Design a protein around this ligand. Structure first.
Ligand code: MAN
Ligand code: CU
Ligand code: CU
Lengths: 217, 217
């Protein structure tokens, strides 16, 4: 149970709560979204229609390292990913990211050792690189942790999400892919989402990361 | 989130919901006790004063195999124990087991190998032997699973509890010990209760079972 209220800007400053990140519904409860088919799986805003317009947009350069800071240690075992979408008409529009335009730029997978998965549950700041070749333009940047501590049953996986609003400058001519929709990216039946992390399947050879591969940009 | 509504009698019959097991407060929620100091940590009854009187008492013999069936798979990782107390004035008295009279008879313990804890989260029926040397008389039989999936913080451990009411016949001359009170047995600071199962401390040699040593009778 945690939120991602703070955008970490290119020079390493942790910005204010919900300044550049769309304030989420769980701003107080810290509870997860658990229905991957729901529209609110996209950015989980306090107000899906009003929150974007109350959120500022951060200017960055393609190639910059940026991040999020969680309100506590990211204490559930899971998979973490960061996905991006061009934001049309702009980063502060609620209609941004409603099409098949999302691509993955970063992930942190559990390790696999001795027939057991290995997790890091002590991280609070998550940082990563905005790809150098990413074209200039407005983008949504979505952090997602899939917490798997009770994921053995359908709808058991817990998703902790935040969407930052970006204005990306000094971009290249890359073509991000593969592309997915959110919701749409998951069914809930994926082997990395519906999973018993404590007693793994017989032919388990490593954590299968769900959704698109990381775009090499 | 599970309950232990069904007593498994000596012949292997899984008995009806709450017949010999005191109906618990989470009879619908399946939610856990989290305050080890609370009086209801004892048997977690729907009504601490009324439930015992509405619960039947199972006649068994010392040496018999008995147990509990949970209402689903016991799917959280943790530590399971079974404790007993002589029940005065009777097994159906709410006053039973209010003293320092509890002893451990059984456990299911997580394993430690290569720096990782190993759990079994697939069991639904828990069976065990009532020690052959146990003195004849009325007893409470308390099953407890300490779920550790979120136990890294104080009060994070989740306790799933059921108390069966027994009339033990054909007993022996054993003297059960060591003895504890419930509440009283735990403080919540035990290294087996206040614990990050995913990222274990430097000087961690193996899972330290909380509470008293198993009484081998
Ligand atoms: C703060 O530091 C960042 C990261 O090195 C730069 O991108 C930025 O121009 C400023 O100097
Ligand atoms: Cu949580
Ligand atoms: Cu539970």
């Amino acid at each position: 149970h945690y939120t991602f209220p703070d955008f970490i800007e290119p020079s390493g400053t942790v910005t204010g709560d919900w300044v550049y990140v769309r304030e989420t519904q769980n701003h107080y409860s810290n509870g997860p979204v658990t229905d991957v088919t729901s529209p609110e799986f996209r950015c989980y805003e306090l107000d899906l229609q009003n929150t974007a317009g109350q959120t500022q947009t951060a200017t960055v350069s393609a190639g910059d390292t940026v991040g999020f800071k969680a309100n506590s240690a990211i204490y559930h075992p899971g998979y973490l990913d960061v996905m991006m979408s061009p934001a049309s008409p702009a980063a502060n529009s609620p209609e941004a990211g409603t099409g098949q335009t999302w691509f993955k730029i970063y992930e942190e997978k559990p390790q696999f050792e001795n027939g057991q998965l290995v997790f890091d549950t002590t991280q609070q700041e998550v940082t990563f690189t905005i790809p150098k070749s990413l074209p200039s333009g407005q983008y949504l940047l979505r952090i997602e942790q899939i917490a798997l501590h009770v994921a053995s049953s359908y709808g058991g996986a817990q998703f902790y999400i935040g969407c930052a609003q970006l204005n990306v400058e000094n971009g290249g001519n890359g073509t991000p892919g593969p592309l997915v929709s959110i919701p749409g990216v998951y069914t809930g039946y994926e082997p990395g989402i519906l999973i018993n992390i404590y007693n793994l399947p017989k032919n388990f050879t490593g954590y299968p990361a769900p959704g698109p591969a990381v775009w090499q940009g």
